[PDB]
Amino acid sequence: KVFGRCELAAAMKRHGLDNYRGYSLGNWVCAAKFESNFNTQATNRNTDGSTDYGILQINSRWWCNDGRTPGSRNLCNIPCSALLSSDITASVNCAKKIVSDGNGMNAWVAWRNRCKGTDVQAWIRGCRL
């Protein structure tokens, strides 16, 4: 599923991401915009053999199990497939853990290189929230 900009804002806000660990809603929508382009089924192979999953491109090395990343963890206790559903609940719950791991949203290199320091509030411009 490809979410609309404001549709994803509303789903992220309803799951408690708006100002989670200090990051306004415009941050998380911006992060998803450039990680997946709001597509829940997005996957990308990383060089180290790990795969990135879903709307917030969550990595199989630490966060989920895909059975094909030797020596990795499953800290969110989920099959990576759960990060790809139209229900964003698993992605959101796993993002909360990542964002709490000590480096904030810098865990997402796309946010740090594309959202950090920008006018992120524009990502919620014109949405009923």
From Swiss-Prot:
Q: Which cysteines are joined by disulfide bonds?
A: C6-C127, C30-C115, C64-C80, C76-C94
Q: What is its EC number?
A: 3.2.1.17
The subcellular localization recorded is: Secreted
Q: Which UniProt keywords apply?
A: Allergen, Antimicrobial, Bacteriolytic enzyme, Disulfide bond, Glycosidase, Hydrolase, Secreted, Signal
**Gene Ontology CC:** cytoplasm; endoplasmic reticulum; extracellular space
Q: Which residues bind substrate?
A: D101
**What is the reported tissue distribution?**
In the egg white and polymorphonuclear leukocytes.
Q: Locate the C-type lysozyme domain: which residues?
A: 1-129
BP term (GO), one: defense response to bacterium
Q: Which PROSITE patterns match?
A: GLYCOSYL_HYDROL_F22_1 (PS00128), GLYCOSYL_HYDROL_F22_2 (PS51348)
Tell me the enzyme class.
hydrolase
Reactions performed catalytically: Hydrolysis of (1->4)-beta-linkages between N-acetylmuramic acid and N-acetyl-D-glucosamine residues in a peptidoglycan and between N-acetyl-D-glucosamine residues in chitodextrins
Active-site residues from the entry: E35, D52
Q: Which GO terms describe its molecular function?
A: beta-N-acetylglucosaminidase activity; identical protein binding; lysozyme activity
Q: What is its main location?
A: secreted
Q: Among its keywords, does the record have Hydrolase? A: yes
SUPFAM superfamilies in UniProt: Lysozyme-like
Q: Is this entry keyworded Calcium? A: no
SUBUNIT field = Monomer.
Misc remark = Lysozyme C is capable of both hydrolysis and transglycosylation; it also shows a slight esterase activity. It acts rapidly on both peptide-substituted and unsubstituted peptidoglycan, and slowly on chitin oligosaccharides.
Give the family per the record: Belongs to the glycosyl hydrolase 22 family.
What does the UniProt record say this protein does?
Lysozymes have primarily a bacteriolytic function; those in tissues and body fluids are associated with the monocyte-macrophage system and enhance the activity of immunoagents. Has bacteriolytic activity against M.luteus.
- UniProt name for this protein: Lysozyme C
> Which species is this UniProt entry from?
Gallus gallus (Chicken)
